[PDB]
Every structure is written in structure tokens, then in C-alpha cells.
Amino acid sequence: LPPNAPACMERQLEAARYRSDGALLLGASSLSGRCWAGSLWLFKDPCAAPNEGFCSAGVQTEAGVADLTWVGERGILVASDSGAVELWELDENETLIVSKFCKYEHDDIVSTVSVLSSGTQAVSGSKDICIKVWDLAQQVVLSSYRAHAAQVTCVAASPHKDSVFLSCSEDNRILLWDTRCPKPASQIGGYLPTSLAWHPQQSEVFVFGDENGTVSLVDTVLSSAVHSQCVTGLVFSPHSVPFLASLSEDCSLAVLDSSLSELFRSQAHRDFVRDATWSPLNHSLLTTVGWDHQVVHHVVPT
């Protein structure tokens, strides 16, 4: 029950991400009822989540949390229902989450957000069809790009190339971006693409999921029908030879190997599975959250 921390956390858990030391960041939305807001939470003990009385820190946001991501070790970057991109920061004590900036640059819900290589810039995509590149220190938009023709479902920063990132959209495009290029987007060659994950060990390799449950491995093709509904997210594990976690509106989590073959399946969740994040400390532990308000800690066989 730490200070300026809401007594109750909202039902619809949207995001879960570990940082280096293993504190767990949670993002929640109230997607029904009287108030449609959101909140941010840090659990230095992840096994206490999502119980509010045993969190390290928490804070209410004005609108729901469609997406978030760590910025470094103390920064939290939030895609808001309000069209805002928000940056919050932990205090030196890590007992308060404090708004750093809240800029209303999109004209619709901000759906996806991703920190670029350097840690000093981020990209956001929105239902307004735009993608924006942000300078986090100057709290300003550096570029706004209207490449797509429909909502921007996902953006993912390149792991090591600070000018390279992916995006996909309901206009059925997957775009590879390199802002060193005069025309910065390129169309990579179906069912609508819904999620993106760069390979952490291979520069030019990524995986994407679609609205029909298929996961695909792509070089700058291999695929498997993993899910019976939309593929909401894709998270490579931290292992030298990584595993690939995939999550779906079908309420399951799958874990896949190098060839997209299934090694693990969980049906613990009773509603949509919304995020998955691998422990830095124990590499076989994988944590999910979903709209059923569960935080599940899977032990993945390796």
C-alpha cells in the first residue's frame, strides 16, 4: 500500500516486463465499468503480483494503458488511450512513480510503443495511422510518418540498429524502416499481420504473427499454425539459442523452438493473454498476464 498508489488495480492487465534486477513492471486498464482509466505498478517481489497491498510502487494514469515498455532501469514509456505518449520515472527511492511528460501528439489511441537501440529515442504507432519518432530527452516528436493506410498494430525497434525498426498495420503491410534512407520505409513481402519480434541474435531475421493464428519466420519462409485466433505478441527468451513465446486471443501461450515447433503450451489463462516477459534471473521462468487478472509464472522445460 505504498504512497500515492491506488488501493485497487484495474481488472484488464495489459503489460508485464522484467527489468535487469528482476523487478516486474505491470500496466493495467479498466476496460469496462464506470471509469475507464489505467495504472502502473512495480513489484520487486513478482510472486506478490497482482496483489496491490504488496507492491513496491503504483500510480493511476488518466486513461487506459494500451502498451508500455521500460526506458532504462527507472523509466516507463506508455501508449495511452488518450492519444498521448507518456514517460513516467521512478524516484531515487523507487517508491513513487512520477509523470515525466505527457504529450498529446497522436489523434487517436496510441496502440504500440518501442524504445530504439540507444535508449534515447522511441517509436509509437497509433490508430490514427501515424508512426512517430520521439526524442525522449527533448520530449518532442522528431518525425511523423504516414506510411500506412490503416491502424498501426505494432512497432518494434531494432535490437542494435538505432535507425531501424519494423511496423505492421491493418493495411496488410509489414514495413522495414531505416531512417538513414531518403524514403525510410520498405515493404517486406495474406492475413493481416498483428505482432512482430526481432531475432535477438540474428540482425536481419524477425518473426511475425497474424490475425489467423499463424507465426512466421522471415529473413530480410517458415511458418506454423500455432494459435486458433489472433497472435497478440511474440517474445524471444534470453537464451543463447532462444525460445519464442507466442500469445493469443485464444487464451493460450505457446513456446516454440528454432523451427517454430511447439515445446510448451499453457492454458492457465481464462481470458486473452496480453503480455509475456522472461525472467532475467531464472531463464526458464516465463511470466504472462491477461485480462483475467492473472499473473502466471510458467516454468518452461529446456
Next chain:
Amino acid sequence: RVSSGRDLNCVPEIADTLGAVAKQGFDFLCMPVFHPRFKREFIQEPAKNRPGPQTRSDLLLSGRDWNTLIVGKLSPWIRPDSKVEKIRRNSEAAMLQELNFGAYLGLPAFLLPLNQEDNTNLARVLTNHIHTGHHSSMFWMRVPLVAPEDLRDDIIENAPTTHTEEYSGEEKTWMWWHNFRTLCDYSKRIAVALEIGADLPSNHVIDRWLGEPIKAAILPTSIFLTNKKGFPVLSKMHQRLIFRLLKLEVQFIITGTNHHSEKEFCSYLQYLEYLSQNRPPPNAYELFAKGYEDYLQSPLQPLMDNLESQTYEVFEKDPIKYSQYQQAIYKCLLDRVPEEEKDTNVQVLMVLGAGRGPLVNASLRAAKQADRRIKLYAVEKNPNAVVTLENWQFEEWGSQVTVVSSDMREWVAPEKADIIVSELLGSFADNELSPECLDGAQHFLKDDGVSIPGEYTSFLAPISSSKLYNEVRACREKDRDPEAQFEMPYVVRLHNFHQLSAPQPCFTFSHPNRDPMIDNNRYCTLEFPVEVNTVLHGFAGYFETVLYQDITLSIRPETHSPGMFSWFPILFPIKQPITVREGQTICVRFWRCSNSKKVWYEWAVTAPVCSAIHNPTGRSYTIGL
């Protein structure tokens, strides 16, 4: 006084949001009635069993507020035409769910997107909803001037943007709308919310929406410029479009976030007010005609029917018209009576159809100003108006005026006229049977006598107006041909419409008709060049008339007598809209038909396709002799 609404996709608390919106000056608020990211499952366990509540409570607003302040929005994840079968099924169930909640709440309108070409299944679900209880609620289809695909930045190195003109391609979104409303069978509950982008298309793309049921125009805050002082404004071209839309009294909707953060947010709205205040007020005519816009009227038949007191009052409230008549009579008196004869030569003037007296007084004022002598007969077959005339005669005119209560075709005149004056014209000139009446009066015109008017000509012009087509369609009546409403003309102040080619003359009549073989039937073929893609719904009709020499009356637009209120246009509909491409010719055929009891019109399109012959044998519409 612009009526304006705020579009939001994020409402943390209804009460607080509604207050903020009202304080900023808006009249209404378009918002989601379910959370826009709250995707719901209807078929597959376990997600289909998600504990409720499925949304916010109806108790959060009063019934009056749901009914008047809230426009609902279809959730953006609902995709009834998805290529994924499961998504199509969930979407249909979710679409019915949200639409039924809207009807549950009594919301006055509900917004649905047309953001792609194929909306077949969305139209089917909407049409199903519409046939599930009779309700007055409106469905606003949110459709852009310019498809997003056609305005995207040219930043995709391996998919450049088109740089060549695609005339019909740039009209694609009109096609999205037209197919959708055709599928939904021109439901009156389905209207357009036209969304305006930062860059406007060619004029022809904009003009495609002429005559469509535009209920709302959506202005994103991103299309506004910034003036020296920092305030949002619009480019002169957008201002042009706004003015055009104010003439249709659409509702304006402000969408997007505030990008002029130095200024507050009523700013976008104050600018709209500023534009509304800056335009020419009601110039006498438009003051008079605003209430009548697109209001269908039965054409008067003053021959067969006895006009009411207040109908004559409408005629008489047009001084420019009668002073045209005065000038025609004046010039004629002078041409007929030399100065040396001004005291010996009394001219016999007959007003044929005098109503309540205005031509009688115009004749008297004309004689005074001409300094000539006239003997007046006031002929009127309507005995109720004859009451007005005989009180005038006893009280004012005296013996100089003889009131004759008689049909001009039966009256045995005691002498012959030097001038017969008449106002027997309808909006289509001869559609009150002015030719037949003057023919039957002719025998008592002197051999060298003058008829005022001396001639008239009707005019036709093809038009597009899905709004007017739907209004005619709604005129089905219980105990007649279910299509008779399309086989009859209407007097209407045409307003939301597109004229497709310049008016061309149709039928002409001259009086006196010296000709020994009088035939008032007519058969005319017209060819209208059309330089746009469009849809034909009917023909506007107007007329011109020569009262005397260069003194005329006209409601044909390019020669409209300035300042004259009398006579709105007439409209001939056709039963079935006809598609017309750029560069095609519209060929129409009009007949004036008669027997001894009735006169009527028949009409038919014969290019680019044939219609049925409309009103064959007068079966739907006749004018009584």
C-alpha cells in the same frame, strides 16, 4: 449559430467528459458506448464467458442526455467483412450488440466507418438491425473525401505513390458510399458523415457528394493552419468547402487532439463560428426560401381547383413581379395609342384570371403612368376571389372596372379587348393549361390585340439528388399504384442537388395563336452533355415568359428575374436511378398530351439507357381542363 460536436475515442468518465465538452461550446459528443479496445468473444471458450459488466451503465446519464447529447461509435475492431471467418462472426455478433445498446439508450445517431471497398456484410448486418423494430435513429457512415491509401506519405521506397491522374479512381470513396447505401436499399436512416483531409481532392471528387444525404462534416484538428497570433485557421480552399457545407446546414464534428496547445480547445470551434458569421445574410429570396428547401409540393392547379385566400396572398407578396407586369402594360399602351389620341382612345384591357386584384391594380397604375385611358374587365372563375374583387370594385375601383365571375373559355364578352393580361403560368410555364385557357379567350381579342404574356418557354435540366429521390420514394400512398409518386411532378425549392447539364428549352407557346390548326400537344427530344460521373434522378423544370417585348419573367437560373420570389422549380422524377459516366449524353423525351378532359406530361430517358415511359396515359397524374 453552427451546431457542432466533439469526436472522442477516449472517455475515462462520461460525466466529466460531457461537462468539459459542453463548457468548450459543443452541442454534442460522439463517443464509444463500449471501450474501443475491449474486444469481446461470442463463440469460443473460455473468453466468451468473460464476467461482466460488458460496459458502462445507462444510469450515468439522464434519458434526455442519451437522447440528445450522445452519438455512438462502432468499436474499431469490429470487422464484419474480414477475410477471417471467425472474425466475421464475432464482428457480426458485436455489431448487433453495440447497435442494440445504442437503440437501448435511445441515442439519436450512431457512427459506422466505410474505410475500405467491401462492406457487403456490414451493410447486411446494419440492414438487419434496421428491420428489427421501426425506429427514427440515424446511422452516420464515416467516409473520407480521400481514402487513406490515396493520401499516404510517399515514403515507401519500393511502393511509390501514384503521380498520374486517375479520374474515377480519385472518386473511389463515393463508390464505397454508393454501393453501401444501394445494398441497404436507400434507407432513410442512413446518412453521410463526410471526413475532410489536410489536402482536398480535385473539384470533381468533391462535387461527387452533391445531392447526397450529408448530415455531418468531420474536421480533424490536424487540417487547421496556424495564423500569426497562433490560432487555428483554415486554408482558403477549405474555407470554400466549409461555406458550401454551411449552405447544407450539416453538423460539424471536430476530431483529433489539440495541436495548438498554446491556445485552448474551443479555439477550433470559435473559428467555425467566425466563418459562419462571415457570409452574406438572407438576401430577401433566400430569407424567404430557406424553410422550403427540398420540400416537395403538389403543383397548384388553379383551373380545376379554387385557390385559397392565403395562396393568393403568396402570389401578391412579390412586388418585383407585378411591377414587371406594370411595365409591360405601360409600354403596350404607349405603342398602341399615339400622344395625339390620348384623350379619345380608350383601350379595353381584360385581366383573364384576376384572382384578388393585383393585375387589376397594375393595369390601373400603368395607365396613369402612361397617361392613357383604359376600360378594365377583371375576369375570375374562382367565386371566392370574386368576393375580394367586388368589394374592391365597390370600395375603390368604381365603374372603370367590371368584374366578371366566369370561365374565360365560356364568357360571352360584350366587346373585344385591346390587351388581355393573364397570370396562368406554372413553374413549368404551361402546366396550369394557360395555352388552353388563352386559346378559348382568343375569340374576344381584337384582330390586332396583344396578349400579355406574349409567349413562354419551359426549360429542362437533368439533375442528381439521392436526397430528393428518397423523398419522392417516401411518397407511397395506401390505395394507388405503389410507384405513382415517381410519375408526377413536384414544385420544390431544389437545394441539395447537382445540375448535370445546362437547362434546355422544352415546350413553347405564343398568344394570340394566329395559326388555323391549333394543336397544344408536344413531343420534344433533348440531348444533355454530361461531363461528370454521376447518377440521374430526375429533371428540374423552369420557365421563361415574355410579358411584352423585352419585359420578361424568368425562373430559369441563368436568366432568373432578379429579386422575384414567385415560382419555385418543378421536378420530374424517374422511377430508377440511372448511372451516367463522364462524357456521356443524357437523352430525355417529353410529351405534352391531352384529351377533352385532361392534359398531362409523359417522359422517358432513352440514353445512356432507356427508362420506362413515365405517366403513360395520365395514369398517375393529370391536369384537369
